[PDB]
Amino acid sequence: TNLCPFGEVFNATRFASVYAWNRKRISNCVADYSVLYNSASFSTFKCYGVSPTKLNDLCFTNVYADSFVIRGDEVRQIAPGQTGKIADYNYKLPDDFTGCVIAWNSNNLDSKVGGNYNYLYRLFRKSNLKPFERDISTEIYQAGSTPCNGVEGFNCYFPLQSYGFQPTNGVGYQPYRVVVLSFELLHAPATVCGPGSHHHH
Numbered sequence: 001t002n003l004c005p006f007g008e009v010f011n012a013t014r015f016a017s018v019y020a021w022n023r024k025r026i027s028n029c030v031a032d033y034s035v036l037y038n039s040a041s042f043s044t045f046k047c048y049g050v051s052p053t054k055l056n057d058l059c060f061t062n063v064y065a066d067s068f069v070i071r072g073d074e075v076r077q078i079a080p081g082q083t084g085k086i087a088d089y090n091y092k093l094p095d096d097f098t099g100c101v102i103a104w105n106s107n108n109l110d111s112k113v114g115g116n117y118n119y120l121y122r123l124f125r126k127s128n129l130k131p132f133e134r135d136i137s138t139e140i141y142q143a144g145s146t147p148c149n150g151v152e153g154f155n156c157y158f159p160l161q162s163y164g165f166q167p168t169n170g171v172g173y174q175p176y177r178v179v180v181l182s183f184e185l186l187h188a189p190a191t192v193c194g195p196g197s198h199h200h201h
Helices: 006-010 072-077 087-088
Strands: 022-025 043-047 063-072 099-105 120-122 160-162 175-184
Touching: 063 072, 072 087, 072 175, 087 160
Parallel strands: none
Antiparallel strands: 022 063, 043 099, 063 175, 099 175, 120 160
16 A cells, blocks of 8 residues: 655665665565656666566566666666676676666766765776675775785775766766666565556556
8 A cells, every 4th residue: 555665765865886786675565667767867767577568567576676876888787798897896787687777867966076086886806796796895906916915015906996976077977876676576475566466456
């Protein structure tokens, strides 16, 4: 009898850095997706594994909302089967992703004259993330063939780098906020249905 809390996700004040991407569990509620896809601001809304017009009717075991900030020319990496700093080291969808990706420009809240440097991404890593892996370590990365005692040593780096968001950036370097709604399907009760489901209609 209660809509799922899409407001806590999409309208939240602050958003996580892509390396520390947040997760929200959405369960035991009615998911009105039409609140989201009939809106106007979303410059990305792309789904996977779901029927073209009947999203507001589907029932899932559980849904997860994952959210974070990246830059515009990386929005194409929030998708299955990509590579790059964001897909490889920061946020990795599985090849068989079931879910939707929703992104919009947030240049008017996440850049500042003089530069906003509080959003980070993982710049280095020895190996790629597994799907939905979250890495928040800051162990000194060894870039060359000489071992690192922390930063003592050549080619020893802190592994995180700040995004530089200035409101005058070109589009590919403006801040975008992202929400990734995973659709989980287990052999279990369906606790997240749309308004048009047989459970509600």
